[PDB]
Amino acid sequence: ELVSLAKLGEMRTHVGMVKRYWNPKMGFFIEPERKHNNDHFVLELQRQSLQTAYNYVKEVAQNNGQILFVGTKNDYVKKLVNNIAKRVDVAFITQRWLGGTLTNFKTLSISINKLNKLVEKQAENAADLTKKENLMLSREIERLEKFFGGVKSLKRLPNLLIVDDPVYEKNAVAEANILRIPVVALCNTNTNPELVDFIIPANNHQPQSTCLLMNLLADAVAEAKAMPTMFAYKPDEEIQIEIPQKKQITSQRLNITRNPEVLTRE
């Protein structure tokens, strides 16, 4: 099968956030509460939702759809998306999601066409560039690459979106919903279930759980486009992973003291 239930339990993909931060509409994916303070999930629901999303993304990638991976979150998520893009040639937006990346696609298409033209001009090279103008062109290349390096490949609106956190990507999921594009996400007890189509009840704070699930989706894509897989349909000795640096791991949401009353009074 896809994964092992004890493996999910060990990667802690069945722990959400503190009970304080939760959307009541996500009560379906949480079993009746208990002395746990971090909103444990239902493992069968996790596996079922993951299998459904896997099947859909596999179908899209086999039928040659264009999927876009979006993480503009912690540096680990950024590097994870970059590695997944290296593994499979899917489009990605690791930097900030630009306003209207999908609903205003014409202007960003103009920008990426300009980026491609500048890139080929620089590659063709010329002695007229000298030093100053060459440096300015290189800096422009660097900026449009940092902000459009994953979008340059596509020429048309993508057929599917994969979001690491719908709460953080509220703009991206809103654009996907207004354009009627499928969007899958790793909901983490604080997300509105209506916006996401293929909900995957999961963790979003654990750098091991997010890595495992993101690599599972990438494994679906890579199997559909036919390379050897990475995590899916694999034993423990190859599924095992490490915990990034910098007793047990602490998925506790803290720092409530930085939420003061809005400036008021007269």
Partner 1 sequence: MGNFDSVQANPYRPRFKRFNAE
Partner RNA sequence: AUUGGGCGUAAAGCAAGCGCAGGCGGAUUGAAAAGUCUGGUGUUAAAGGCAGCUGCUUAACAGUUGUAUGCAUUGGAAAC
Partner RNA sequence: GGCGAAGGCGAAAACUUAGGCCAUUACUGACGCUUAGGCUUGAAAGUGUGGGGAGCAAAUAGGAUUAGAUACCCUAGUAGUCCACACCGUAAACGAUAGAUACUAGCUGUCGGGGCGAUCCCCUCGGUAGUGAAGUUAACACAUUAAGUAUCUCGCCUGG
Partner RNA sequence: CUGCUGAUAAGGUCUUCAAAA
The residues that touch partner 1, with contacts defined as CB under 8 A, are 28, 52, 56, 59-60, 63, 65, 159, 182, 193-194, 196-199
Residue 28 contact partner, candidates RNA, partner 1, none, CB within 5 to 8 A by sort of partner: partner 1
Rg of the chain (C-alpha set): 21
In whole angstroms, how close is the CB of 248 to RNA at the nearest point?
A: 21
Under the criterion CB under 7 A, does residue 32 sit at the interface with RNA?
A: no
Q: Considering beta carbons, is residue 84 or 176 the nearer one to partner 1?
A: 176
Residue 93 contact partner, candidates partner 1, RNA, none, CB within 5 to 8 A by sort of partner: none
Under the criterion CB under 7 A, does residue 36 sit at the interface with RNA?
A: no
Under the criterion CB under 7 A, does residue 114 sit at the interface with RNA?
A: no
The residues near 249 (Cβ < 8 Å, ≥ 6 apart) are 12, 206, 208, 243
In whole angstroms, how close is the CB of 33 to RNA at the nearest point?
A: 9
Q: Which pairs with CB-CB distance under 8 Å and at least 24 residues apart come from 193-197?
A: 193/23, 193/25, 193/26, 193/28, 194/25, 195/166, 195/170, 196/163, 196/166
Query: How would DSSP label each residue in 80-145?
Result: HHHHHHHHS--EEE-SPPPTTTTTTHHHHHHHHHHHHHHHHHHHH--GGGTTHHHHHHHHHHHHHH
Under the criterion CB under 7 A, does residue 96 sit at the interface with RNA?
A: no
Residue 207 contact partner, candidates partner 1, RNA, none, CB within 5 to 8 A by sort of partner: none
Q: Considering beta carbons, is residue 19 or 121 the nearer one to RNA?
A: 19
